[PDB]
Design a binder for this molecule. Structure first.
Ligand SMILES: Cc1cc2nc3c(=O)[nH]c(=O)nc-3n(C[C@H](O)[C@H](O)[C@H](O)COP(=O)(O)OP(=O)(O)OC[C@H]3O[C@@H](n4cnc5c(N)ncnc54)[C@H](O)[C@@H]3O)c2cc1C
Ligand SMILES: Cc1cc2nc3c(=O)[nH]c(=O)nc-3n(C[C@H](O)[C@H](O)[C@H](O)COP(=O)(O)OP(=O)(O)OC[C@H]3O[C@@H](n4cnc5c(N)ncnc54)[C@H](O)[C@@H]3O)c2cc1C
Lengths: 412, 413
C-alpha cells in the first residue's frame, strides 16, 4: 500500500513517520534539496544552535511535547521577559495596555467565542485594527498589541481579520520552549526513523490526478508517482499553481487564494562578548531590528549569540541589506536601549530568501473576508488529504503543522 | 442665503468652501486640527526651495487641478520621471520592466476588467492583486518590480490590495510629473484667501451629525452646534465610523468606511551643500528604509541641493521613531548602493509630522480584497448630507480626485 506525501516540511515528515510505522510505503516528494521546510538550524562553530526558521514551542503544545518525548529528544525553557523601545526604553513587565483597555479586549474575545457562524462571517469583514479602533481602543494601545502579536503573525494588525485575531486570542501562542540541538533535531529525528520511505528531492509536484482508485502525482521532471492516497502538506500558493484533475473544490481554491503569507526574517550575530547587561534579554522595537534577544543555547559558551527577528517590510529591507548594514541595525537597537557600544561581530547567519515559491517567508495570515478558509483547505478530496500549518487548529505553529499530520493520517 | 456646513479643511473641504462662496452661499467650515490643508503641507526652506511634506505632484492631464491652479493665478512646473532601481544590483532608469510574457498577461487582465459584469468583478475582488497575478503566471520578480512601479500611489504592498481595484486603476494610473510653483500648499493658501462669507472653526472636531426638520445639525467636541441647509463631509473613513449619525449611516456605507485601510507614507528632505547624485532628473527606488529618493529642488540656481525621500509601509513607523542622524544614514546607504557612498554634507532636515493621524491620514485610502463597491457606497448622499474627499473620487487617492469630489458634492446643493 503506497501513500504519497507532498512536501518535506515537518508536517510531511511527521505524516511519513506515522504512515511508515503502520507498514505503508511512503513516497515523499520535496521541491527543494533539503527536508525541514520552514525549520532550519545552523550549528555554529561555538557549539550554539541557530534556528533560522521555527525556534520555539509553547510548554502546553501537546503534539510537539508528545513527539519530542517519543523520539527521546529534550526541551529547554526560554524565559520571555521582553523590553520595549517605543518613544523611550520601557523595562520588561511594564508596557502592557491598561487594565481597562484589556477589559475591552477580553469582552470582544468572549463575544467572538459566543456569537454564531453568521455573526462571525460579519465580524470577519473588518480588520482587527479597524474593529478595535471602532470599539474605542487608542492608536497607542493598538501599537502595543502590534508588538505583542508580532512574533506570531509577522504582519500588521491592519492586514488581519478581526474574527481570526479574536479567535486566536483564546489561546495565543507563547514562544517559551526550545528543542535541545535546535528545532532541526526534531525534523532530523523523524527522517532517521522513517522506514520504507522513498524521498524525491529537487523535483516539485506540478500536477495531481485522481480516478480509477489511484492518485497520480507528476513532478517537473516528468516523473509519475502513483498511490492509494495522497497527503498534501503544500503551501497555499502551490495549491493554486499545481494542475488538479479533477479541479480543486471551488471553496478550497478560493481559500488558497485568500491566504497571505507573512514575512519573517531572522539574523544571528556571533559576538566576542555579551552586548546586553541582564539575563533573559529580549526587546522589541519598530526599527529594522524588530525583536532582538540573547539566543545562546550552549550555557557555558565564550561566544555570545544575538538573535534578531524582523517582520513585514523589514524582511525586504533585510533581504536587500549587506551584513555590515544588518550589524548596524542591531547596534542602533542596542543603542536606544542604552548600549550603543560597537558590537564585536565574529560571524553572521541570516534567512535564505531564494526559494519562497516553495518555502513560505512566514505563516499563513487570514485577511478580512477569509472566514472559513482553514475548514475549506483542510477538507479532503476523496483519497487526497490536506495538512500543513494552514489547516490546523493552532495554525501557524510547529504544534499545528504536527497536529495536521495526525489529522490527515487518521483518515488513511 | 442658505448655510452649507463643510466638515474638514483639507483641499476637498477648501475647494467645496470656495465653490459655495463663489455663488454667495454662507459656509461654516469645521476643521479638527489647528491648520487648513490636511494631507497637503509645504515647508519653505531658508534656501528658497519648497519642501512638500504631503502631496507633491499632479499629473499633466489632471484637468480639475490644472484648471483651478490657472483660475487662482498659480503656475506648475514639469518633473521629469527617470527612476533608477536598486534591487539585487543598480539598474539604470528605463532598464527595469517585468517580463514581456507578464506584461502581455497584465494587458489582457486590465482589458478583461472593463468587459466583465458586477458578479465577475465582486469575485475578482475577493483576491489580492499579488495572489491573482501570481496565479495567472506572473513571477515573484515581476510582482516585486510592479510593487516599486505602483508604490508612489498606493504606498503599500500589492499583497494588501484588491485585484479588482488595482486592475480598474491601471486604465488611467496616476503619474507624478507636475509640481506647483511655491509648493502644493500654495494651492490650499490661495483657496483660503478666496473664501468670502466663510466662518472657519479650528481645532474643534465634529463628533455628531443629525438631520431632520429640513436642517443638518453638526456638533463638535467643544459642544458647538452648527446648523445648515446641507452638509458636505470631506472626513476620512475612520472618522465616519466614530462620529454619531442620526439617522444612522446606511449599513453599506459604515462597512465601506471600516474596510478602508490608509497607507503610510513618510517624507524626509535633506538640505545638502553638494549634489549626492551624478545625473540630472535623479530619482531611485529600493526596498531599503529609504524607498524612493529624488532630486527635489524647486529653486533655479540653488547652491543648496534638496534630496527628497518617500518611504512606505512599515518604513513609516521605522522612520517616525528614528533620530535625524539615523534618517541621514538610511539615505546615505541608499545612495551607496547606487555607487554614491560619499558622506553627505547635511545643512538641515525636515520630516513628516506623525501626531494627528486620527484626523489626517498617513497616506491614501487603500481597498483590500472584499472592498468592491466601497467608493460608490462612501459617495452616496444621505438627503442633504453629501460626501467628498479623495476616497469618494474616480481618481481616488490624488489631489485631482479630492478636487473633483468637491465639485460633485457642491453641484448637488
Ligand atoms: C522564520 C519563521 C519563524 C517561525 N517561528 C516559529 C516558531 O518559533 N514557533 C512555531 O511554532 N512556529 C514558527 N513558525 C511557523 C512554523 O515554522 C511552521 O508553521 C511550520 O514549520 C510549517 O510546517 P509545514 O510542514 O506546514 O510547512 P513547510 O515547513 O513550509 O513545508 C512545506 C514543504 O513543501 C515543499 N513544497 C512546496 N511546494 C512543493 C511542491 N510543488 N512539490 C513538492 N514539495 C513542495 C516545500 O519545499 C517545503 O519543504 C515560523 C515560521 C517562519 C517562516
Ligand atoms: C504623504 C502623502 C503624499 C501624497 N502624495 C501625493 C501626490 O504627490 N499627489 C497626489 O495627487 N496625491 C498625493 N497624496 C494624496 C493627497 O494628499 C490626498 O488625496 C488629498 O490631499 C486628500 O484631500 P482630502 O481633502 O480628501 O483629505 P485631507 O487632506 O485628509 O483633509 C481632511 C480634513 O478633515 C479634517 N478632519 C478629520 N476629522 C475631522 C472631524 N472629525 N471634524 C472636522 N474635521 C475633521 C482633517 O484634520 C483634515 O484637515 C499624498 C498623500 C500623503 C499623505
Amino acid at each position: 500500500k503506497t501513500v504519497i506525501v507532498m512536501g518535506g516540511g515537518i508536517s510531511g515528515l511527521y505524516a511519513s513517520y506515522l504512515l511508515s510505522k503502520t507498514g505503508i510505503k511512503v513516497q515523499l516528494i520535496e521541491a527543494t534539496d533539503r527536508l525541514g521546510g520552514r525549520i532550519r538550524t545552523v550549528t555554529d562553530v561555538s557549539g550554539n544552535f541557530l534556528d533560522l526558521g521555527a525556534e520555539w514551542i509553547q510548554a502546553e503544545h501537546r503534539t510537539a511535547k508528545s513527539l519530542i518525548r517519543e523520539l527521546g529528544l529534550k526541551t529547554t525553557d526560554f524565559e520571555v521577559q521582553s523590553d520595549l523601545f517605543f518613544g523611550s526604553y520601557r523595562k520588561f513587565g511594564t508596557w502592557d495596555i491598561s487594565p481597562k483597555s484589556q477589559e475591552i479586549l477580553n469582552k470582544l474575545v468572549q463575544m467572538n467565542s459566543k456569537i454564531n457562524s453568521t455573526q462571525q462571517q460579519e465580524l470577519d469583514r473588518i480588520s482587527f485594527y479597524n474593529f478595535l479602533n471602532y470599539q474605542g481602543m487608542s492608536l497607542e494601545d493598538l501599537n502595543i498589541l502590534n508588538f505583542k502579536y508580532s512574533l506570531y503573525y509577522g504582519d500588521s494588525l491592519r492586514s488581519l481579520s478581526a474574527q481570526k485575531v479574536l479567535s486566536d486570542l483564546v489561546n495565543f501562542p507563547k514562544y517559551n520552549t526550545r528543542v535541545e540541538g535546535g528545532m532541526e533535531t526534531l525534523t532530523r529525528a523523524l527522517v532517521s526513523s522513517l522506514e520504507n520511505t522513498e524521498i524525491i528531492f529537487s523535483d516539485p509536484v506540478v500536477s495531481v490526478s485522481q480516478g480509477e482508485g489511484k492518485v497520480i502525482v507528476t513532478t517537473v521532471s516528468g516523473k509519475k508517482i502513483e498511490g492509494n492516497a495522497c497527503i498534501s502538506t503544500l503551501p497555499a500558493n502551490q495549491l493554486t499553481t499545481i494542475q488538479w484533475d479533477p479541479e480543486l473544490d471551488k471553496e478550497k481554491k478560493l481559500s488558497a487564494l485568500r491566504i497571505r503569507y507573512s514575512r519573517i526574517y531572522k539574523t544571528f550575530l556571533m559576538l566576542r562578548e555579551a552586548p546586553w547587561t541582564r539575563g533573559s534579554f529580549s526587546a522589541y522595537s519598530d526599527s529594522v531590528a524588530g525583536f532582538i534577544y540573547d539566543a545562546g543555547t550552549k550555557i557555558n559558551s565564550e561566544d555570545k549569540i544575538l538573535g534578531m527577528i524582523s517582520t513585514g517590510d523589514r524582511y525586504d529591507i533585510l533581504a536587500s541589506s549587506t551584513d555590515a548594514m544588518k550589524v548596524e541595525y542591531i547596534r542602533l537597537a542596542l543603542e536606544s536601549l542604552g548600549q550603543g557600544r560597537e558590537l564585536q561581530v565574529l560571524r553572521i547567519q541570516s534567512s535564505e530568501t531564494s526559494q519562497s515559491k516553495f518555502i513560505p517567508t512566514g505563516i499563513a495570515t487570514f485577511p478580512p473576508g477569509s472566514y472559513g478558509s482553514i475548514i475549506s483547505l483542510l477538507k479532503p478530496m476523496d483519497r487526497i488529504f490536506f495538512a500543513g500549518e494552514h489547516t490546523a487548529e493552532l495554525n501557524g505553529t510547529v504544534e499545528g503543522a504536527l497536529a495536521s499530520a495526525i489529522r490527515a493520517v487518521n483518515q488513511v
